[PDB]
Amino acid sequence: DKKTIYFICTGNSCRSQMAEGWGKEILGEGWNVYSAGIETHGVNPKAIEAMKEVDIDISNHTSDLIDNDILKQSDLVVTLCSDADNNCPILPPNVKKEHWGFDDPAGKEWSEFQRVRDEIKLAIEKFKLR
Numbered sequence: 497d498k499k500t501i502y503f504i505c506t507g508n509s510c511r512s513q514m515a516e517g518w519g520k521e522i523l524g525e526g527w528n529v530y531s532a533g534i535e536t537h538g539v540n541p542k543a544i545e546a547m548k549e550v551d552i553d554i555s556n557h558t559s560d561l562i563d564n565d566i567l568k569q570s571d572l573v574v575t576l577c578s579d580a581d582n583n584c585p586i587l588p589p590n591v592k593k594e595h596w597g598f599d600d601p602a603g604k605e606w607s608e609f610q611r612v613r614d615e616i617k618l619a620i621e622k623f624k625l626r
């Protein structure tokens with residue numbers, strides 16, 4: 497019935513966390529949305545604040561490493577950064593993978609953090625229209 501999308505960024509901190517938040521809202525009807533990373537950097541407080549601004553609560557999200565069982569059941573694995581794309585483990589044959597590159601918002605001025613958040617919204621909206 498429900499399909500599964502898996503958002504991956506290096507530390508499961510900013511990009512993948514915002515993508516999970518947007519995904520649960522926009523694709524929530526027929527999609528199970530999860531996020532992971534190559535390493536765990538913790539859920540960025542700025543990502544929680546960025547999502548709170550658009551009335552999406554991601555405060556209960558966790559920073560997790562990639563799980564082989566979630567990978568196995570994924571219909572689409574989406575990598576959100578170059579490092580995550582290149583270091584993503586060998587995927588099961590039936591699982592599709594796409595790289596949706598976004599700039600690293602961590603280290604950028606607060607306005608640019610919000611810009612990346614909204615670029616992610618747009619990519620997820622376009623995905624729903626496929």
Ligand SMILES: [K+]
Nearest residue numbers: 531532558560
């Ligand atoms: K997660």
